[PDB]
Amino acid sequence: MLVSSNVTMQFGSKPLFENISVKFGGGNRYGLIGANGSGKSTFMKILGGDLEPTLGNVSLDPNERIGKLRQDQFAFEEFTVLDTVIMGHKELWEVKQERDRIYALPEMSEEDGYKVADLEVKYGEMDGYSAEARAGELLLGVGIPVEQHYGPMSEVAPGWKLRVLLAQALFADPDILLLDQPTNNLDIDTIRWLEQVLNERDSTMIIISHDRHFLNMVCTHMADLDYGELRVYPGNYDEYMTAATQARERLLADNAKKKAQIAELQSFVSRFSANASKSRQATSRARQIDKIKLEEVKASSRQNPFIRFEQDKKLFRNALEVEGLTKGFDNGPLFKNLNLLLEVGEKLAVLGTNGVGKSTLLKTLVGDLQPDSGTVKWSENARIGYYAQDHEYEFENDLTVFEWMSQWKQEGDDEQAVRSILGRLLFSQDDIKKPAKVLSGGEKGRMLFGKLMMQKPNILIMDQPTNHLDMESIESLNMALELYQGTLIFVSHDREFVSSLATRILEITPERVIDFSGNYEDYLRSKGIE
RNA sequence: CCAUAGGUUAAUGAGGCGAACCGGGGGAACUGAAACAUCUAAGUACCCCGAGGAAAAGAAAUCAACCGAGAUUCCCCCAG
RNA sequence: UUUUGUAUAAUGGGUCAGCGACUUAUAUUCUGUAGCAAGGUUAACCGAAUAGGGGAGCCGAAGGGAAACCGAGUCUUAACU
RNA sequence: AGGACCGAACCGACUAAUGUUGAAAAAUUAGCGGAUGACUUGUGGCUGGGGGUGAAAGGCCAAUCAAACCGGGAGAUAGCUGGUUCUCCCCGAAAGCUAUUUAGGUAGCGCCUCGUGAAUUCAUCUCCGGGGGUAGAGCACUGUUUCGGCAAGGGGGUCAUCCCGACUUACCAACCCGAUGCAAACUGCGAAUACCGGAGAAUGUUAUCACGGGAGACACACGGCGGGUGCUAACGUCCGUC
RNA sequence: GUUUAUUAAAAACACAGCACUGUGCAAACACGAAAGUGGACGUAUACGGUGUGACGCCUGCCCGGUGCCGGGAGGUUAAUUGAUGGGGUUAGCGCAAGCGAAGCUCUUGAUCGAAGCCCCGGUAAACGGCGGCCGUAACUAUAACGGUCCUAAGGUAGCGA
RNA sequence: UUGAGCCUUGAUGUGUAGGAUAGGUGGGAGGCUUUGAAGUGUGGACGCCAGUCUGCAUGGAGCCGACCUUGAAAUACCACCCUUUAAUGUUUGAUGUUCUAACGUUGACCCGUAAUCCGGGUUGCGGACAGUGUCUGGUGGGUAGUUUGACUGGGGCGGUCUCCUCCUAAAGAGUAACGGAGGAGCACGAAGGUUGGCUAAUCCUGGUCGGACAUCAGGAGGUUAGUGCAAUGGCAUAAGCCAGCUUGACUGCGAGCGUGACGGCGCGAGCAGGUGCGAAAGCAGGUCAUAGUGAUCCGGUGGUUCUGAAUGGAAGGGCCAUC
RNA sequence: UGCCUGGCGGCCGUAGCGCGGUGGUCCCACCUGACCCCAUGCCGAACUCAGAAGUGAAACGCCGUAGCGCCGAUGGUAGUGUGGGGUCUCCCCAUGCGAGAGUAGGGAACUGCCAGGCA
RNA sequence: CGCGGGGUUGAGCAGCCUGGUAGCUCGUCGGGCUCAUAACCCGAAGAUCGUCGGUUCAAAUCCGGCCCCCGCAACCA
RNA sequence: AAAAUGACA
Ligand SMILES: Nc1ncnc2c1ncn2[C@@H]1O[C@H](COP(=O)(O)OP(=O)(O)OP(=O)(O)O)[C@@H](O)[C@H]1O
Ligand SMILES: Nc1ncnc2c1ncn2[C@@H]1O[C@H](COP(=O)(O)OP(=O)(O)OP(=O)(O)O)[C@@H](O)[C@H]1O
Ligand SMILES: [Mg+2]
Ligand SMILES: [Mg+2]
Ligand SMILES: [Mg+2]
Ligand SMILES: [Mg+2]
Ligand SMILES: [Mg+2]
């Protein structure tokens, strides 16, 4: 079973995590939780050996095939989907490709023949004969068609190849699964399939997830990464959240009721110390006061960012109008004969879930995706704040966080007012010196929220604004957008964030759009969903 | 019911005292540590039991070092 | 006697006579003296025995290093002018 | 009838005097409270030491009680007090520094003494080579101070009190200039002494240094000079040197 | 009535009366290393512990703290049990390095595990506690009155230099 | 009744592309059915719901591998097994009801006995509970041993206790007071090394917002500025300010000194081995210097044939680096 | 050898500032150009290169001047080692040492080694 | 002046709790309901966070001085 | 459901 001892990673002048030593193993599944920027991804990198710790150890058995997940790479793109999911087995992939190379190079001499016979028997023991079949029976579960199973990695879509990268990790029942945010930008049906296929396995799995309904579904232990110490509570999710609460409140109460007695042994020392017949008794109360040592409270890293979008110039009457916006890439009718008029104050939630033009509507509205036919007439003064689903291009350039946030300073504000946004977004003194490239996913979504806030738009378009954000962030931004007085266009899958704030639903089905004029609860009752 | 428990008679032995030495059952504290609790004083003082002219121990399931010695007890070194 | 300092009004003693306080054992070191002198000396014990025997053993003539080890050298160091 | 009333025996002990080496290691004299009751008394018995008994005071347990008396461990320990016994000859201190559960104890060093071994070793004076920053002094610097000159600028009165300031100002006033002082924590100056080193005589029973045996002492006092504190008070208190 | 025999005889102690609490009998409680004794040759109208101290009128509010009583769902938790992992040794395969069966060993400690504590409620003739600031009435004065903060609750009847 | 282990028996473990809900080995492929059928007449359970397993029979005597699409073949079947399992057995557990036989009886009767002790015998009632022993968690002033600092203008309170800078400090060093004043318990991968260059404060005159004070251009001034941090001493050859390259913020040593009662602390040319900057002479063993810190014991981690209690190993010690 | 000039020193204001004058054959400075060898947080202003029309304006060197800076006696004063004295918070006497400020005054340097030109 | 607790709109108080948001209950002011007042409903007003300085991009918060108010304390033989 | 008050003459 995997063990870690005193990992202690540190880049800067503040503790990140200290003397982490924990045994992971035994078939238990450890949901690893924390704040949006504490330690989780750089800890599953350490557990897999991607970066060695500053000073520490990670111990694994001589043969224990780590099945870990991507989302630190996107561009393998040299071979077919079948042989892309195959190479999750780093052992079998090498023997397979090496024997193919040997077959390519002439001839099978005695060095070549004896080099190849044992590799062939190794392949047989590893059952590579039925490797592609078992890979395909998993690609079908993920949702990739049989007729294009054998297509190269350029045939696949950019939003469809993360599916294959997910399928790679859990290929052939590998013990110890390092899953790093697997359910992000996935649908309800795929999430249900994944949480069903992980429920039939005896393999320790350490999973990062910022949602509650998946951790509370699959996980057994609830390893935390807050305060610095990795506190592991054996609990589902709710018996962790109801245990840490009283664990912290007991500490607070003990400090209160132990300071309240120092304040009582102090009223005697302050009154009878100078006396002669009572100084002996007043200088033993001082010993009692000094021998108390109330224990310290360190604030949790969770916190709650203060986000609020305002609007510089409110605009009246219609804010948008879309007239005959038929468009499709290679399936033709991505959305057929769209026709709509968006008023002011609308909170339009565009639903519909998977591969259909759930996005590319927002891309056409902003204009970066030219439509096939139609014209989109924004309001006269319409200023659009765009939060793209894939926002890497704005951080590939490596500026300091301060300069990156200062790019968008407007006419009438200082770099005193620039740093206030970062302060409200919880970038304190060193995390404003990091390169913009090296930041967490949630710490990056927040940094885009602080650019929208800084620009102060009157039309907000947001492609999945609930990505890599913990409960605190999707509770702050939810009310930040609720208080918003303006036009909002957003898309999300979780049936809570969209239901909290929406006055109109426009969801597209791969044959025809359907529009509504009420909130999501009425939408479901009219659909026939209980 | 047999039988045991119990009763009577007879034969033999013991009982108490004594200075030290000896074997065993229990077992302090002052004191030293420049305070004190681990530790020392010390298995000492003292209490109790038992025997002897002495008592205990004693004839390797011991040491040694692959060379060997040969029960126990006491004295001088090893050795502060 | 104790004190920086007592005629001190600081302590002790009424006087006489007798008793009353740096000792003994074993180890170690330095001085003096005596014997022997790269040698010196025995302990227990035997012994008609303060003689003689007994040299088990102790101290000294070689040191350096934590140690193996080397040895008028040795340790340090990869090596030391 | 009565934990009833007055009052002797009987039990007790509120006040005063005497007595304090007493008649007595708690009493006598004149008064005083209870006196059929939770009373008082004779004889015998039981409870024993961290234990007894206690209408409760730490009271009583053989003139002894916040832990009896006797014997033993025992000659407990005492950084504290006292005492320490015959004679002569030579040398002869310290009451300081450092450390201390340390401050009236002790350890190392400084000072004393005995032995051994060594070089003009050491001391005084004359001459030569040195570094000061004290006394004194000075006011360029750091502060402080009083005058006089020029006065930036600043407060006050009149008028459109939008401006510009159109004015004024008996009043304040920095920086510079000339004159006059003060400073432990000021110095563009600067002694006497003292101290370090070298050379030279004369003088001094090696007075110098090293090693080894034995210590004592680490409570100081006053007087002159230089000073901190105090009141330039104290036979006050804390340092330097004699 | 008792008390410091021998400097204190009192307002101190005891008391009848009152209340709380323990005790179902081989009672609780005490003296005992234990046997056994007192309680008691008694049986809840009896016995022990604690406080108050005839009698008359009465004995207010607070369960946050500390005790005591009841509750057991949940968390933590000893001995006991010893699943796993790591190391030592070595029959052998290799005369290279090196691995290394069985056994014996050193260590690590999964699982089981009660009371207590955390938690929930009660109890004050259980130990105990019982508030600040500001304004306001026909002359002055004072506030019956009002605002607010805090507390577990803010000292009631009676008495008061 | 309910946990857990084990054994025996039977099921369940399609997505394609297949006749059809095939688990992997491979034995065979011609074998399964008449001690009485594929279908039928009819039960229940399971499910990706398409389909599988089972009682018996009026009748019943016949179904599949050969083909075929797959990486792979078939309830023709048996085998040794794997996952989820269902049932009966068997092992210890937990719980609850009964029982008597250990154990209790300070219930009744008889005897030793002329005995409200004790013992034995019948009987009744409790009954594997209570109680006792070893180990163990809680409570435990009921009891016992003890600790509860020093300086100090008497003691107590207040203040202080180690390190750095100035004055007292009497022109070498040192020098006290509960004397007068301030600081430290770090920081910096550049604020370290080298090479190349550069020189400040403060006013005086001319200009957009622009002002007494911002940037510009002249002149006076002279280090009155600056130094990561308190003060003192320094600093122009700059130790102050920029830039290029770099890691000497190296290893073993070290003549000779300074300062301490010691433990110790500090300065150091030069030597050897390997570097950096510079063309080169050369400079670099952290920073302008002085604060930024605690012995020993005990223990942890890494290296090293030094030792290894018969011998070969090992534990354990030692040494080096470090916590 | 005499004069001028350049480099390296000695010495460090009696040596430095201010005012006036003067020097271009050589030397020195300014000077022309800049693609390139090099360089500017922009600018050949600085650093650097190829040359040489002009000038001695500025800088530099030399000479003259006291308006500053600077040096500075003699005498007296203060202080002080040793020995004495007083009316002793401070002084005095014998003896030895003897400033600081100020005054008279001095004063716009002196000098070595090479290398060029005019002699 | 030795030690604590404070100074936040007119009154009484949070926010200091590890600097990025100035808030509560009552009150004042202007409307509405009412015959009229009170209550009630709506809208707004106002604080140099006692006053000075310091690192700080940013102070009420962190540090120090000064002033004011409330409690103490300044011992025994 | 909440609804208090109105000097004398
Ligand atoms: N190179 C880097 N330099 C500085 N900080 C870094 C660097 N790489 C990562 N970090 C920091 O490490 C942390 C990583 O946070 P982490 O990835 O666990 O966040 P998350 O959003 O919770 O994770 P996840 O993406 O897995 O859901 C962040 O605080 C990030 O700033
Ligand atoms: N850049 C592109 N180049 C080519 N085809 C594209 C591109 N972007 C999208 N597509 C095609 O258009 C389709 C629409 O994708 P779209 O972004 O609308 O999906 P989605 O519902 O937002 O996906 P998801 O939730 O997985 O991110 C894609 O599935 C793909 O086939
Ligand atoms: Mg006998
Ligand atoms: Mg002792
Ligand atoms: Mg002692
Ligand atoms: Mg015998
Ligand atoms: Mg004396």
Ligand SMILES: [Mg+2]
């Ligand atoms: Mg005296």
Ligand SMILES: [Mg+2]
């Ligand atoms: Mg005399």
Ligand SMILES: [Mg+2]
């Ligand atoms: Mg006398």
Ligand SMILES: [Mg+2]
């Ligand atoms: Mg005396």
Ligand SMILES: [Mg+2]
């Ligand atoms: Mg006398």
Ligand SMILES: [Mg+2]
């Ligand atoms: Mg006599």
Ligand SMILES: [Mg+2]
């Ligand atoms: Mg005698």
Ligand SMILES: [Mg+2]
């Ligand atoms: Mg030797």
Ligand SMILES: [Mg+2]
């Ligand atoms: Mg009577």
Ligand SMILES: [Mg+2]
């Ligand atoms: Mg009477």
Ligand SMILES: [Mg+2]
């Ligand atoms: Mg009477």
Ligand SMILES: [Mg+2]
């Ligand atoms: Mg009496």
Ligand SMILES: [Mg+2]
């Ligand atoms: Mg009396």
Ligand SMILES: [Mg+2]
């Ligand atoms: Mg009488």
Ligand SMILES: [Mg+2]
């Ligand atoms: Mg008595």
Ligand SMILES: [Mg+2]
């Ligand atoms: Mg006692």
